[PDB]
Amino acid sequence: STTLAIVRLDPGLPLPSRAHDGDAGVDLYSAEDVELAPGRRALVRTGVAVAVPFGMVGLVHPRSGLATRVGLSIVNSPGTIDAGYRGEIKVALINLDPAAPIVVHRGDRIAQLLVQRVELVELVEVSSFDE
Amino acid sequence: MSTTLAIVRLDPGLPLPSRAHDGDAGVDLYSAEDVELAPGRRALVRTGVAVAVPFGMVGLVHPRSGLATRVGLSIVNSPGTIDAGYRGEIKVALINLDPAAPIVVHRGDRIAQLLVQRVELVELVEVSSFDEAGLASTSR
Amino acid sequence: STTLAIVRLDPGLPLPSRAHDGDAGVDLYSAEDVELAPGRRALVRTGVAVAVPFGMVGLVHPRSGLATRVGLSIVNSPGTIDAGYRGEIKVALINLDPAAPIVVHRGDRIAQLLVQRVELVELVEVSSFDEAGLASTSRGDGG
Ligand SMILES: O=c1ccn([C@H]2C[C@H](O)[C@@H](COP(=O)(O)NP(=O)(O)OP(=O)(O)O)O2)c(=O)[nH]1
Numbered sequence: 001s002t003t004l005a006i007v008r009l010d011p012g013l014p015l016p017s018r019a020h021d022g023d024a025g026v027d028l029y030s031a032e033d034v035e036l037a038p039g040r041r042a043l044v045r046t047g048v049a050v051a052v053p054f055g056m057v058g059l060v061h062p063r064s065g066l067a068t069r070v071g072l073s074i075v076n077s078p079g080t081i082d083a084g085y086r087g088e089i090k091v092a093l094i095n096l097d098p099a100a101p102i103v104v105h106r107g108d109r110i111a112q113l114l115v116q117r118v119e120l121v122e123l124v125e126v127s128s129f130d131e
Numbered sequence: 132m133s134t135t136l137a138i139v140r141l142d143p144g145l146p147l148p149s150r151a152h153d154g155d156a157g158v159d160l161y162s163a164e165d166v167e168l169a170p171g172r173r174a175l176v177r178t179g180v181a182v183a184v185p186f187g188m189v190g191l192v193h194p195r196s197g198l199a200t201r202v203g204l205s206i207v208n209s210p211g212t213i214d215a216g217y218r219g220e221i222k223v224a225l226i227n228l229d230p231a232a233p234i235v236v237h238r239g240d241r242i243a244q245l246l247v248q249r250v251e252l253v254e255l256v257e258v259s260s261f262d263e264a265g266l267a268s269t270s271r
Numbered sequence: 272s273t274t275l276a277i278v279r280l281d282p283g284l285p286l287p288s289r290a291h292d293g294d295a296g297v298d299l300y301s302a303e304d305v306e307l308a309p310g311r312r313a314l315v316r317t318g319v320a321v322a323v324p325f326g327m328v329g330l331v332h333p334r335s336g337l338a339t340r341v342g343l344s345i346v347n348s349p350g351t352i353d354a355g356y357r358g359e360i361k362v363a364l365i366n367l368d369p370a371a372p373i374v375v376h377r378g379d380r381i382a383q384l385l386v387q388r389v390e391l392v393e394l395v396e397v398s399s400f401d402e403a404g405l406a407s408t409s410r411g412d413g414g
């Protein structure tokens with residue numbers, strides 16, 4: 001078990017948690033009410049900040065059910081949460097349905113957060129690859 | 132020098148997903164159905180397979196690059212997350228992001244790729260603030 | 272400890288770099304100027320080729336700033352760069368804003384590249400999840 005320090009910037013939301021055992025991610029809540037008309041986007045506060053360990057990355061993924069049912073997606077998916085980042089996690093939701101709005105209420109689960117190792121590669125410039 | 136991934140062909144008529152080259156990150160998933168997507172429209176497509184992602188790992192459903200450029204095919208929830216506990220059929224939320232040309236998916240077409248990666252099953256520890264936790268000062 | 276070999280196919284762009292220590296991605300440059308009208312897409316050259324090590328994968332992710340501010344996205348995100356690939360990295364940009372075109376100039380940072388280990392799992396066909404001792408889990412076929 002890797003530990004992850006989290007601050008509830010919004011104390012009124014539940015702490016993100018694993019929907020089932022072995023699940024890859026924890027769901028993030030919206031701190032806000034917002035309505036997305038077809039094709040529109042918004043940057044939604046989640047009410048949390050995290051300290052992803054050095055050598056790791058946090059990844060913000062859309063939820064499948066809302067994706068199919070209403071066309072909810074994320075413009076920068078997967079969103080990359082860097083180890084050094086100590087601000088509020090924000091989710092760039094977009095409505096990809098052509099005709100119907102998406103209604104987001106505060107306290108809805110709008111995205112999921114995974115933590116993974118990342119290779120912090122040193123780039124080494126070469127003149128050519130070995131053919 | 133990795134593990135196996137157990138896979139069921141719920142639809143025995145499709146080929147088993149396979150890793151085309153030894154280093155390729157993903158195995159391609161096929162469509163079990165015919166579906167036509169008009170511009171801007173989406174569908175939830177069955178792949179005909181179920182997998183058993185190992186505990187401590189995750190399955191990741193990513194788009195194929197060719198179809199993305201050639202016709203604007205995308206996946207609404209990309210990257211799709213396949214959890215270790217899930218034993219249902221993998222489904223792909225396809226969308227046509229081209230403004231004008233319909234995309235026709237045929238049964239047997241490759242529509243996505245499935246990667247498997249380790250994931251950290253984190254224990255969240257609530258802190259009152261970062262300065263007060265002893266871990267503020269960063270690069271950002 | 273891991274290095275990534277990289278060739279600047281376009282010698283007039285900087286080598287990609289990490290914006291801050293610990294950051295997961297290096298930012299990729301556009302080699303070209305492109306204007307994307309609402310809903311249109313382009314395949315944009317970055318001027319670099321890389322050699323992802325066997326056992327790893329390169330992943331091309333959108334940058335959050337441009338995504339939120341102008342609706343810039345990547346059609347096949349996350350773009351998968353395989354260990355066997357030695358061609359130029361190309362980015363399938365798309366303008367998801369309904370009204371405003373996006374202008375990209377040569378030298379702009381239009382995406383970021385992560386490298387991660389990948390599990391090169393050996394697929395084994397089984398008859399069913401019950402017969403493989405695998406039908407006992409937290410979800411079943413729910414989700
Ligand atoms: O964002 C990307 C993604 C891929 N690529 C390159 C790297 C990679 O290994 C290669 C193939 O990726 P896909 O499998 O996603 N495309 P597709 O399955 O259509 O073609 P192929 O038959 O080559 O696998 O294209 C990029 O340059 N940028």
Ligand SMILES: O=c1ccn([C@H]2C[C@H](O)[C@@H](COP(=O)(O)NP(=O)(O)OP(=O)(O)O)O2)c(=O)[nH]1
Binds near residue numbers: 082089334
């Ligand atoms: O979905 C996201 C993605 C990023 N972020 C925060 C966390 C991260 O470390 C940071 C930067 O992400 P990007 O590198 O994708 N954005 P960009 O390159 O535009 O800005 P920067 O100069 O900060 O890296 O923004 C979010 O809150 N939500």
Ligand SMILES: O=c1ccn([C@H]2C[C@H](O)[C@@H](COP(=O)(O)NP(=O)(O)OP(=O)(O)O)O2)c(=O)[nH]1
Binds near residue numbers: 063066
């Ligand atoms: O692209 C996908 C994504 C997920 N899935 C399956 C696998 C996964 O374990 C499951 C749940 O995924 P999400 O957590 O993204 N969906 P949601 O949060 O809507 O449903 P649930 O309440 O079950 O978690 O659905 C697919 O078949 N295809």
Ligand SMILES: [Mg+2]
Binds near residue numbers: 019063
């Ligand atoms: Mg879920």
Ligand SMILES: [Mg+2]
Binds near residue numbers: 195196
């Ligand atoms: Mg491929």
Ligand SMILES: [Mg+2]
Binds near residue numbers: 290334383
């Ligand atoms: Mg950045």
